[PDB]
Amino acid sequence: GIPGTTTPITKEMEPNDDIKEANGPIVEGVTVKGDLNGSDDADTFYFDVKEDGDVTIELPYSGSSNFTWLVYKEGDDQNHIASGIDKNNSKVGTFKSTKGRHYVFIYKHDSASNISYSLNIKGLGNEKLKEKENNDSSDKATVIPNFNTTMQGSLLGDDSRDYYSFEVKEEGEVNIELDKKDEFGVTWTLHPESNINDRITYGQVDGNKVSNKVKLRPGKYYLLVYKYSGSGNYELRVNK
Numbered sequence: 001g002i003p004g005t006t007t008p009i010t011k012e013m014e015p016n017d018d019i020k021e022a023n024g025p026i027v028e029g030v031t032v033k034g035d036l037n038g039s040d041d042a043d044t045f046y047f048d049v050k051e052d053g054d055v056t057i058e059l060p061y062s063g064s065s066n067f068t069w070l071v072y073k074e075g076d077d078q079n080h081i082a083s084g085i086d087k088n089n090s091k092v093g094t095f096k097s098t099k100g101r102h103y104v105f106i107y108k109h110d111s112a113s114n115i116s117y118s119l120n121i122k123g124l125g126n127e128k129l130k131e132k133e134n135n136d137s138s139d140k141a142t143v144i145p146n147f148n149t150t151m152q153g154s155l156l157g158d159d160s161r162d163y164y165s166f167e168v169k170e171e172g173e174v175n176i177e178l179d180k181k182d183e184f185g186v187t188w189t190l191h192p193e194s195n196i197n198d199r200i201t202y203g204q205v206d207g208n209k210v211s212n213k214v215k216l217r218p219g220k221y222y223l224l225v226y227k228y229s230g231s232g233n234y235e236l237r238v239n240k
């Protein structure tokens with residue numbers, strides 16, 4: 001039936017020549033490489049839109065410009081809803097969609113052509129996950145699996161600490177935003193895995209958010225969300 005695997009791809013895997021054998025999932029922030037060389041004239045990928053909004057596909061390429069991409073939404077494999085425009089040696093386009101599975105079908109018109117491409121998709125939205133109690137110590141931290149996840153948590157009553165972990169795979173600035181659903185005293189601290197006492201940064205209140213940006217190098221990190229007054233619910237986004 002419809003593949004439900006959650007492991008993203010970074011590279012195509014033939015055969016992927018129509019919607020029924022599409023490679024995927026492609027996720028935001030992870031580049032996929034492939035090529036349409038010789039008689040390989042079509043490649044198909046799928047991706048999941050997690051929140052309604054505007055989705056952008058950018059496909060930088062080298063080789064012939066004689067090809068394009070079409071997008072289809074699950075449920076209608078005949079009528080494509082968007083196609084790419086050539087701009088500066090890439091095929092780009094933005095289209096509005098609603099949540100659900102979509103397919104990008106890249107195909108060339110002349111089978112003498114050699115084309116290689118990389119594919120970037122943006123604007124897919126965040127998946128919402130719940131924290132997993134008990135997460136009151138770093139060894140029981142709830143894993144944040146990628147940088148397109150909103151974690152939903154609460155600190156009601158006895159529960160005063162929620163530890164989360166995330167991995168940074170390449171150096172860059174990370175944005176940590178806790179959104180307070182209720183008015184209470186909550187904050188967060190960030191720690192390296194190797195030194196749970198070394199405090200790297202601390203969240204700063206700005207209106208209803210407690211946030212900070214920090215440049216981190218590759219590695220695993222612990223994020224402790226803890227309350228110092230009242231009780232309430234929050235959502236937690238770690239963004240790149």
Ligand SMILES: [Ca+2]
Binds near residue numbers: 014036037040043
């Ligand atoms: Ca291919």
Ligand SMILES: [Ca+2]
Binds near residue numbers: 044
């Ligand atoms: Ca193919």
Ligand SMILES: [Ca+2]
Binds near residue numbers: 155159161
């Ligand atoms: Ca909790």
Ligand SMILES: [Ca+2]
Binds near residue numbers: 134135159160162163
């Ligand atoms: Ca907890």
